[PDB]
Write a protein that binds this ligand. Structure first.
Ligand code: 1BN
Ligand code: ZN
Length: 294
């Protein structure tokens, strides 16, 4: 019926490594600016129509973040669309590290940041080469991970997180923007990771979770996409669902012992713990979903 393209895991892995090779993508650093230029340029080289959303976002403590959401659009005139999201900034503090002396050191964010973006770059390459029926938007969200440090004494507000998705959700890149549904990729490269149906995703978009997990099973990734409800996670999709009202699910790992991968918000979130086979399982599932939408 439909020939779904084959996600190239080696290609995706290299897009992950290329981001990490800039160093930490902390908002307001030259490394962040350079990586943003790399990502926008790559989308444009893969035939996307690129819209940049530069915004002055205010962090939990009053810090102004020079943020840039990057949107790459395929079949831009189609009104029938699927939105694919990943955050591209990295966290400026390894505030979950086992050693306190690292709690003020920026992470490399290989899994938390680079993995989702790298997977979506590989999807963008393939969408260009053979388009699905629906228009696809690849949306790289800034300033997701500048939320209140664990060491901070004071108010820990939910809205300190996901500043780029909040901005995008209130201020779409094109007036009247609609999508049938959305998929957010968050930490999709970790060795041995499995993905359960996330709680907010189940509450806002259970039909989309069903679609995605059925697609994974059908494509042979049923051992990676486990048909079971996991944790409820504050992530970009919460704000997208609440503010933009696009039914959006989160593909995010769940481990029974650590919840998130053990590298999460530690100085160990680097390429040593990225497995291209995890990228493959997630990326191929996303392809299976978008190419079977009519
Ligand atoms: C608290 C805040 C945010 C999250 C989600 N998240 C995803 C990547 N880094 C953090 C989980 C708990
Ligand atoms: Zn994070």
């Amino acid at each position: 019926v439909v020939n779904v393209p084959q996600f190239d895991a080696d290609s995706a892995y290299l897009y992950v490594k290329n981001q990490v090779d800039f160093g930490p993508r902390v908002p307001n650093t030259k490394e962040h600016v350079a990586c943003g230029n790399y990502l926008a340029g790559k989308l444009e080289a893969f035939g996307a129509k690129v819209t940049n959303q530069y915004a002055d976002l205010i962090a939990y403590d009053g810090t102004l973040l020079k943020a840039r959401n990057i949107i790459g659009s395929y079949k831009p005139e189609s009104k029938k669309r699927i939105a694919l999201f990943a955050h591209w900034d990295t966290r400026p503090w390894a505030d979950n590290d086992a050693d306190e002396k690292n709690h003020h050191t920026p992470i490399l964010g290989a899994n938390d940041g680079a993995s989702g973006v790298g997977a979506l770059l590989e999807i963008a390459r393939l969408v260009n080469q053979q388009q699905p029926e629906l228009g696809i938007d690849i949306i790289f969200l800034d300033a997701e991970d500048y939320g209140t440090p664990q060491f901070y004494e004071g108010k820990h507000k939910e809205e300190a997180w996901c500043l780029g998705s909040q901005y995008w959700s209130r201020n779409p890149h094109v007036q009247g923007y609609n999508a049938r549904f959305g998929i957010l990729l968050d930490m999709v490269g970790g060795e041995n990771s499995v993905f359960l149906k996330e709680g907010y995703s189940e509450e806002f978009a259970p039909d989309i979770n069903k679609k995605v997990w059925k697609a994974a099973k059908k494509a042979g990734y049923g051992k990676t996409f486990i048909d079971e409800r996991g944790d409820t996670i504050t992530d970009d999709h919460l704000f997208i669902n609440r503010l933009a009202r696009i039914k959006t699910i989160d593909i995010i790992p769940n481990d029974p012992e650590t919840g998130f991968p053990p590298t999460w918000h530690t100085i160990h979130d680097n390429m040593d713990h990225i497995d291209k086979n995890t990228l493959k399982a997630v990326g191929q599932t996303v392809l299976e979903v978008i190419y079977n939408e009519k």
